Design a protein around this ligand. Structure first.
Ligand SMILES: COc1cc(OC)c2c(=O)[nH]c(-c3cc(C)c(OCCN4CCCC4)c(C)c3)nc2c1
Length: 111
């Protein structure tokens, strides 16, 4: 069902949800619950929410055309966090740490 490149991507997904990175990955596991957090303007500012559970749903449903589309969704997750938050926010620090893991593994993708 999966190309060599999308298997590599599924392995990155597994890595990003693994306990090793939980200290900083956890705000990305589920969709941002704007009402529960009191972020009443989140969905006015962030037009296309993304999180690791959405990515995992897509991967399980074979919805990614290619590894580039997978990378676009993971990068959107991070970009939404940088767009909504100020630069010194604790969740932005977490996003940068998780994104370092993502980009490094993504770069080792096979030809
Ligand atoms: C638990 O998982 C997540 C995941 C997240 O993204 C992946 C976010 C995220 O993007 N932003 C925030 C967030 C941001 C701000 C500015 C904030 O403060 C509003 C009121 N403050 C007092 C008055 C001035 C501002 C609050 C409470 C939460 N929380 C998240 C939690």
């Amino acid at each position: 069902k999966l190309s060599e490149q999308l298997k590599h991507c599924n392995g990155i997904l597994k890595e990003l949800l693994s306990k090793k990175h939980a200290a900083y990955a956890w705000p990305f596991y589920k969709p941002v619950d704007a009402s529960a957090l009191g972020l009443h303007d989140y969905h006015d500012i962030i037009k296309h929410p993304m999180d690791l559970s959405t990515v995992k749903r897509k991967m399980e449903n074979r919805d990614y055309r290619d590894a580039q589309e997978f990378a676009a969704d993971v990068r959107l997750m991070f970009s939404n966090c940088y767009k909504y938050n100020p630069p010194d926010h604790d969740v932005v620090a977490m996003a940068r740490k998780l994104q370092d893991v993502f980009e490094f593994r993504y770069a080792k993708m096979p030809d």
